Design a protein around this nucleic acid. Structure first.
Ligand SMILES: NC(=O)OC[C@@H](O)C[C@H](NC(=O)[C@H]1NCCC[C@H]1O)C(=O)N[C@@H](Cc1c[nH]cn1)C(=O)N[C@H](C(=O)O)[C@H](O)c1c[nH]c(Cl)n1
Ligand SMILES: [K+]
Ligand SMILES: [Mg+2]
Ligand SMILES: [Mg+2]
Ligand SMILES: [Mg+2]
Ligand SMILES: [Mg+2]
Ligand SMILES: [Mg+2]
Ligand SMILES: [Mg+2]
Ligand SMILES: [Mg+2]
Ligand SMILES: [Mg+2]
Ligand SMILES: [Mg+2]
Ligand SMILES: [Mg+2]
Ligand SMILES: [Mg+2]
Ligand SMILES: [Mg+2]
Ligand SMILES: [Mg+2]
Ligand SMILES: [Mg+2]
Ligand SMILES: [Mg+2]
Ligand SMILES: [Mg+2]
Ligand SMILES: [Mg+2]
Ligand SMILES: [Mg+2]
Ligand SMILES: [Mg+2]
Ligand SMILES: [Mg+2]
Ligand SMILES: [Mg+2]
Ligand SMILES: [Mg+2]
Ligand SMILES: [Mg+2]
Ligand SMILES: [Mg+2]
Ligand SMILES: [Mg+2]
Ligand SMILES: [Mg+2]
Ligand SMILES: [Mg+2]
Ligand SMILES: [Mg+2]
Ligand SMILES: [Mg+2]
Ligand SMILES: [Mg+2]
Ligand SMILES: [Mg+2]
Ligand SMILES: [Mg+2]
Ligand SMILES: [Mg+2]
Ligand SMILES: [Mg+2]
Ligand SMILES: [Mg+2]
Ligand SMILES: [Mg+2]
Ligand SMILES: [Mg+2]
Ligand SMILES: [Mg+2]
Ligand SMILES: [Mg+2]
Ligand SMILES: [Mg+2]
Ligand SMILES: [Mg+2]
Ligand SMILES: [Mg+2]
Ligand SMILES: [Mg+2]
Ligand SMILES: [Mg+2]
Ligand SMILES: [Mg+2]
Ligand SMILES: [Mg+2]
Ligand SMILES: [Mg+2]
Ligand SMILES: [Mg+2]
Ligand SMILES: [Mg+2]
Ligand SMILES: [Mg+2]
Ligand SMILES: [Mg+2]
Ligand SMILES: [Mg+2]
Ligand SMILES: [Mg+2]
Lengths: 70, 129, 123
RNA sequence: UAGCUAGUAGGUGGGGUAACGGCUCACCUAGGCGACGAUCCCUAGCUGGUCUGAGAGGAUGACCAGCCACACUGGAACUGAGACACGGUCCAGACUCCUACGGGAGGCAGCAGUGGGGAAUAUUGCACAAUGGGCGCAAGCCUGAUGCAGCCAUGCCGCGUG
RNA sequence: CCCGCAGAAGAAGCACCGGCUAACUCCGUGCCAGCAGCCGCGGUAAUACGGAGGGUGCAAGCGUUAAUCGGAAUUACUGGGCGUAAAGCGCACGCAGGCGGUUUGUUAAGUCAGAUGUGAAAUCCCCGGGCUCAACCUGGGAACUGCAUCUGAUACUGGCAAGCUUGAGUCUCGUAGAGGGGGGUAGAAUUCCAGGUGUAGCGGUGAAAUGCGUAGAGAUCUGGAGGAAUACCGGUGGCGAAGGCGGCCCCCUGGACGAAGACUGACGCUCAGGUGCGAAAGCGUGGGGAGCAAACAGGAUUAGAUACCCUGGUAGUCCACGCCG
RNA sequence: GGCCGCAAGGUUAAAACUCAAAUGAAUUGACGGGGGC
RNA sequence: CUUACCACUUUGUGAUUCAUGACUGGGGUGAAGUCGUAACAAGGUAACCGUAGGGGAACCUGCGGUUGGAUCA
């Protein structure tokens, strides 16, 4: 959390367990899982959207989605 | 088959008590007579009797104090599948001693009190209570 | 079971098992952190958790938790591990000992210091 | 892991041991062991005791005492009352060291101590004043046994920080 | 070990505070970062995360990890279970083995009593003594439940001998039965074939189609062939160790039950290994083949329909001898 | 792995690993292309 | 000098076991993959057991058995 990393990306394909494959503005692909409120707000994500992706410096291969472009 | 007559005697007394019968009868045997005498002199039964020469029958007359059986627990110990012997130092106490335990001494059959008074061990036939 | 059947074949004690086999009954073991990464918990809880893959001195590979806020580990750092499970993470059976060998103590902790290898702050 | 055993089980006569014995050899008999587990495989020094439990039981064999076995690995014997012998001998083997390359030397699982392994385990100390042991007529010599000191909150017990 | 000197003068930390479990509030934080033995906590007022104030528990220590026992009656000897929660072999026969009805005599192995020897010291427990107390050391006793021998006891179990009829078995007289094996035979019905009449539809479905018919179907009458199963009695029934057993007659054969009497004299119950029987499907060799009917062909249904539905149809179903279990 | 079988297979019979359950009986409601008035 | 017994050793042969290992097989976990609706009510063809054949799957059909099946209209 300290010194967080903030990026956008595009979701490419659906995975089981509501996890997702997202290409990143820098060319990298990451594995993403949903946050609580867009889970609590019943907001479902489809293929192809632009999404805001939080990253952590410990590992950049997997991130978390926090905001989807409708 | 019938492989344990004393256990049979005990169960007959127990069922007869539960069924509020005045008396029960079963084929006699000298060992059964000895056990029955021991019970009678301790006050668990009213009287006992034997009749017939060719095939004698042993009769026990049960006792009810307040409409409920005086005998309220009988268990065989030293059953044929597993024999039990105790020394003088170990003769047990049943119901903390309000009850009795029949033991066969070289001297014969007698309660645990008598057996430890005489200073004998023996085989534990049954607990009564 | 009738007495005869027990004489022929006695009772059997239920054989016990240890849930930290890699320790081999030692209280701690040394190992090299071949891989450092972060995983996700199970259904009820959501978080990203720090974890490591380590090769012990006795030949095993195991996955161990890195407690506390922030760590300094590397793909070849040397650490001391101890028994302990992480309930959420599946297949994690061990904990890293903070403030021992290369694993440094949590910075600026001020309560429960002994559990994180932090020295009494001078005043 | 259901069969095992031919010196295998007995007997007679030589031989051999401090001593009984297939202990060994010649001959004869055809036995002997096993479901009450022989044979085979894996694992293990044994006991007084220790920890736990109300008890029956369960786990265990560090310290101290008794018994057993081993002394780099394998084979053998001599000397001796007693060894097939930790600081003795011969042979074989691996390793280390010396060499004029002709051959030679060595065995800390004794007390300190070193490298290595490991989460982790002490000083290359003082005395033979006390107890015990070897030699000696005795004086006495020898003794890393033993007595004591050093290091470590490892444990138990007592005390202070007013 | 004793005496004197200075000055409080040289000497306090670790964990925890949502429930089990002793101890709560503010500020950060927003299911994030993080905690965790379990029950779980964290998405805008968190006594559960991080800091602070306060409090609780231990104290020269305090916590975590490792390992054993306990709680766990959760391997149940003391002290558990098997109709449906896990747990009665598919059924029967039987060797070793386990247990045994009733009386008398004898024996003394089990069993009970006494004595002797032994059970190293240390350890444990009890009562005292010495270190300023304590840890620690130490004197006496208890204990070491065990083993061995000698002398006695004779109720019970065991051995030996001889009895007994109540368990078990044999004989005579009757009764019921789809119990089993072999050989004959009767009736109704589907299919096929021949013949007469007859005339163009039949069959099938939720609706259809595939299919069959002038070479004469379907319908109706007469004769012949072949195979398989027993209308109705029929049960709320019976027989069998279990699987299972149904037209009628004959032959060979097992078991069960009732009456009264006679005979043997415990001759018994159970059973690890072992040996037999064991629906249907299936395998091998050789026959048979009406009705069915996996596979498969064709017609439909549906979005699809490798199915349910419709027209056909092979193995099999049947017989003899082996196998499977 | 052993034994049996022409073959299909039968019989004897484990562990790693993983979860905090799985299960039996019965209770009150909802539901049925289940009944009855 | 020579004979017997014999460790160690070298060959060949077998057995047994550890390490790995090209590869092949299946098993467990899954909060918003895909494709169907097989089961729970008469789950819309009552379910299940043994056995044989067949199909992308959850399954379908033949033979025999059980009720751990609803209605008896
Ligand atoms: N996608 C797909 O598979 O098809 C759709 C499916 O829903 C059809 C449905 N079919 C059924 O129920 C089966 N039930 C068993 C027998 C055969 C069949 O009937 C059906 O609706 N049937 C109707 C008639 C029909 C119309 N279209 C196709 N079939 C029907 O009559 N069903 C009957 C009923 O409702 O009980 C029954 O099924 C039946 C009796 N006789 C016949 Cl034929 N069918
Ligand atoms: K007679
Ligand atoms: Mg010979
Ligand atoms: Mg001789
Ligand atoms: Mg001689
Ligand atoms: Mg060893
Ligand atoms: Mg207990
Ligand atoms: Mg106690
Ligand atoms: Mg020892
Ligand atoms: Mg032992
Ligand atoms: Mg040692
Ligand atoms: Mg030597
Ligand atoms: Mg020597
Ligand atoms: Mg020696
Ligand atoms: Mg030496
Ligand atoms: Mg040394
Ligand atoms: Mg060293
Ligand atoms: Mg090291
Ligand atoms: Mg001296
Ligand atoms: Mg010297
Ligand atoms: Mg010295
Ligand atoms: Mg100290
Ligand atoms: Mg002073
Ligand atoms: Mg002051
Ligand atoms: Mg409280
Ligand atoms: Mg905490
Ligand atoms: Mg707090
Ligand atoms: Mg907590
Ligand atoms: Mg504080
Ligand atoms: Mg217990
Ligand atoms: Mg139970
Ligand atoms: Mg069930
Ligand atoms: Mg069951
Ligand atoms: Mg049965
Ligand atoms: Mg069977
Ligand atoms: Mg017998
Ligand atoms: Mg008897
Ligand atoms: Mg005796
Ligand atoms: Mg005695
Ligand atoms: Mg002693
Ligand atoms: Mg005192
Ligand atoms: Mg003492
Ligand atoms: Mg004494
Ligand atoms: Mg007798
Ligand atoms: Mg039409
Ligand atoms: Mg015609
Ligand atoms: Mg019957
Ligand atoms: Mg007959
Ligand atoms: Mg007799
Ligand atoms: Mg059997
Ligand atoms: Mg058949
Ligand atoms: Mg058809
Ligand atoms: Mg129910
Ligand atoms: Mg359905
Ligand atoms: Mg096909």
């Amino acid at each position: 959390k300290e010194d967080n990393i903030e990026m956008q990306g595009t979701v490419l394909e659906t995975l089981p367990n509501t996890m997702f494959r997202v290409e990143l503005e820098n060319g990298h692909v990451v594995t993403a899982h949903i946050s609580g409120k867009m889970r609590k707000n019943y907001i479902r994500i489809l293929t192809g959207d632009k999404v805001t992706v939080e990253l952590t410096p410990y590992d950049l291969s997997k991130g978390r989605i926090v905001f989807r472009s409708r | 088959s019938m492989q344990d007559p004393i256990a049979d005697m005990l169960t007959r007394i127990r069922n007869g008590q539960a069924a509020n019968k005045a008396a029960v009868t079963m084929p006699s045997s000298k060992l059964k007579v000895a056990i029955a005498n021991v019970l009678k002199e301790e006050g668990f039964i009213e009287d006992f009797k034997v009749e017939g020469d060719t095939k004698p029958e042993l009769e026990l007359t049960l006792k009810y104090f307040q409409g409920k059986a005086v005998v309220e627990s009988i268990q065989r110990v030293s059953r044929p599948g597993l024999r039990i012997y105790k020394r003088k130092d170990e003769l047990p106490k049943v119901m903390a001693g309000l009850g009795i335990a029949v033991v066969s001494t070289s001297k014969g059959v007698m309660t645990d009190r008598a057996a430890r008074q005489a200073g004998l061990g023996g085989e534990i036939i049954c607990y009564v209570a | 079971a009738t007495v005869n059947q027990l004489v022929r074949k006695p009772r059997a004690r239920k054989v016990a098992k240890s849930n930290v086999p890699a320790l081999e009954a030692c209280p701690q073991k040394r190992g090299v952190c071949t891989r450092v990464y972060t995983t996700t918990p199970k259904k009820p809880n959501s978080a990203l958790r720090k974890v490591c893959r380590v090769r012990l001195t006795n030949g095993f590979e195991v996955t161990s938790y890195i407690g506390g806020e922030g760590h300094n580990l590397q793909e070849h750092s040397v650490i001391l591990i101890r028994g302990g499970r992480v309930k959420d993470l599946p297949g994690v059976r061990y904990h890293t000992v903070r403030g021992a060998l290369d694993c440094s103590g949590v910075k600026d902790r001020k309560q429960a210091r002994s559990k994180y290898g932090v020295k009494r702050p001078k005043a």
